[PDB]
Amino acid sequence: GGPIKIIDPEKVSKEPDALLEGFEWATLDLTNETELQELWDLLTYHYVEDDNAMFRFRYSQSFLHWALMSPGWKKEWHVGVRATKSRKLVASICGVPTEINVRNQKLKVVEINFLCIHKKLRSKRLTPVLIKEITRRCYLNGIYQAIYTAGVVLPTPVSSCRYYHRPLDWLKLYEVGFSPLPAGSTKARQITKNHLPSTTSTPGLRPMEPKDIDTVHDLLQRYLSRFALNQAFTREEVDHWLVHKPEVKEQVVWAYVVEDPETHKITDFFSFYNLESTVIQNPKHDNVRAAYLYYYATETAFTNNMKALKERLLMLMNDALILAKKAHFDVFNALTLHDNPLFLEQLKFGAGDGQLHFYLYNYRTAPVPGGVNEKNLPDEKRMGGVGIVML
Ligand SMILES: CCCCCCCCCCCCCC(=O)SCCNC(=O)CCNC(=O)[C@H](O)C(C)(C)COP(=O)(O)OP(=O)(O)OC[C@H]1O[C@@H](n2cnc3c(N)ncnc32)[C@H](O)[C@@H]1OP(=O)(O)O
Numbered sequence: 586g587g588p589i590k591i592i593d594p595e596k597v598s599k600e601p602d603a604l605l606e607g608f609e610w611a612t613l614d615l616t617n618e619t620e621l622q623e624l625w626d627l628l629t630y631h632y633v634e635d636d637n638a639m640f641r642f643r644y645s646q647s648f649l650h651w652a653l654m655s656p657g658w659k660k661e662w663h664v665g666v667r668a669t670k671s672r673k674l675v676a677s678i679c680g681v682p683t684e685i686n687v688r689n690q691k692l693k694v695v696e697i698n699f700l701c702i703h704k705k706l707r708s709k710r711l712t713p714v715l716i717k718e719i720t721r722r723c724y725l726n727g728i729y730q731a732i733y734t735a736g737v738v739l740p741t742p743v744s745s746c747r748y749y750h751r752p753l754d755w756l757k758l759y760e761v762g763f764s765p766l767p768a769g770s771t772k773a774r775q776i777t778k779n780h781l782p783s784t785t786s787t788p789g790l791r792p793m794e795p796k797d798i799d800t801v802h803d804l805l806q807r808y809l810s811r812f813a814l815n816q817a818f819t820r821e822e823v824d825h826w827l828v829h830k831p832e833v834k835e836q837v838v839w840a841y842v843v844e845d846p847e848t849h850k851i852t853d854f855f856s857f858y859n860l861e862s863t864v865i866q867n868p869k870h871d872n873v874r875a876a877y878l879y880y881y882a883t884e885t886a887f888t889n890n891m892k893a894l895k896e897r898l899l900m901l902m903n904d905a906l907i908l909a910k911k912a913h914f915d916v917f918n919a920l921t922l923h924d925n926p927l928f929l930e931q932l933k934f935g936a937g938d939g940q941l942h943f944y945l946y947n948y949r950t951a952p953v954p955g956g957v958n959e960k961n962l963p964d965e966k967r968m969g970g971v972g973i974v975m976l
């Protein structure tokens with residue numbers, strides 16, 4: 586594939602477009618505590634819900650700091666819209682830079698996320714305006730392509746992946762309306778079915794440390810290179826995205842490595858992050874604590890023995906579940922991307938209603954497989970496609 590259009594630097598406007606009357610553009614500075622708080626206030630009450638308005642994402646302030654001030658970040662790519670009078674933040678749209686590989690052409694992109702409009706301003710076509718404005722700011726900085734994901738179908742997705750959910754506290758999930766009771770089953774059977782071992786099995790599993798950064802970087806890059814569409818990690822990005830710094834307020838990222846008991850080389854790693862959802866108007870529960878499978882890698886993949894890879898992943902990911910369960914998560918979420926179809930059904934992940942659609946701006950490439958077939962069920966012959974995860 587390649588770029589759709591070339592942008593003329595000479596022609597990029599130095600001024601933003603008009604906004605709806607009574608509103609103005611505002612660059613957010615998320616190193617200001619009070620500004621990070623305003624973003625959090627906006628997302629907490631207006632960001633992504635399920636269709637039934639039972640749950641809303643509640644990215645924490647630590648999470649917002651981590652996701653939005655990643656290497657190369659610029660405050661210019663954190664775009665707010667404020668009410669002119671009250672100064673209230675009523676919309677946002679954000680970018681951070683990264684590099685991605687699209688069938689072996691590397692591209693400098695922004696990843697767009699945290700598009701949000703206050704409920705009272707919805708269905709006024711402010712979205713195109715937000716998009717066009719962040720687009721202008723990216724073009725002024727020499728960035729002309731983007732990748733983004735959404736839970737909704739929009740023109741020309743590059744891929745689509747299904748959400749899967751492994752219950753950790755099945756009864757809590759039942760009570761909030763997250764997890765159904767299967768037709769002929771009972772709650773006891775579901776509780777029994779979701780039990781997990783009390784201890785991990787992979788020899789040499791331990792938390793990731795800073796000293797592991799270069800090795801993990803090498804291993805993740807080799808492994809991600811197996812996917813048509815992947816994120817091309819830098820060392821700083823591995824540092825930022827994979828290593829928790831206990832000095833955030835509230836841990837966001839959990840990373841574990843496998844140090845081979847004999848060679849002491851790291852041969853595997855996996856990571857998962859913390860994203861809670863507000864439970865809406867339920868007097869007995871206000872929260873679902875989800876862990877999401879993030880990046881991982883294993884040397885076993887380079888053998889191209891799909892059976893040995895499966896085996897290894899069943900072991901590593903069951904350990905990920907045990908760990909998430911010890912860390913008090915209520916559910917573990919994963920998508921059908923990476924080599925995830927190899928283990929999802931076997932580790933008792935249930936199929937979700939949600940889908941994650943992947944999109945590129947200003948770049949054309951052939952559709953990429955998303956780990957599912959025509960029935961939207963996991964498919965080991967439709968992997969090797971999506972090797973990027975967005976937050
Ligand atoms: C070179 C750099 C380029 C950088 C830019 C790259 C592109 C980045 C793209 C942004 C990627 C963001 C990634 C994420 O953050 S995905 C998460 C998005 N956030 C939410 O779902 C939060 C809850 N919902 C809302 O806040 C509002 O409903 C939003 C803001 C989503 C739309 O507000 P509203 O409901 O009031 O609608 P409107 O009247 O203003 O506008 C209607 C138009 O907007 C199109 N639409 C609706 N939803 C989305 C969506 N999720 N991505 C892209 N476009 C979307 C829609 O098809 C229609 O298009 P069209 O009629 O023109 O065909």
Ligand SMILES: Cc1nn(C)c(C)c1NS(=O)(=O)c1c(Cl)cc(CCCN2CCN(C)CC2)cc1Cl
Nearest residue numbers: 633634635640641642734735736862937938939976
């Ligand atoms: C528990 C829950 N909270 N929220 C807010 C939602 C939608 C749920 N249900 S769910 O099954 O976990 C689910 C469902 Cl139904 C649907 C989706 C698609 C959401 C896509 N978002 C997540 C990533 N972001 C970059 C784009 C917006 C994600 C999830 Cl995580």
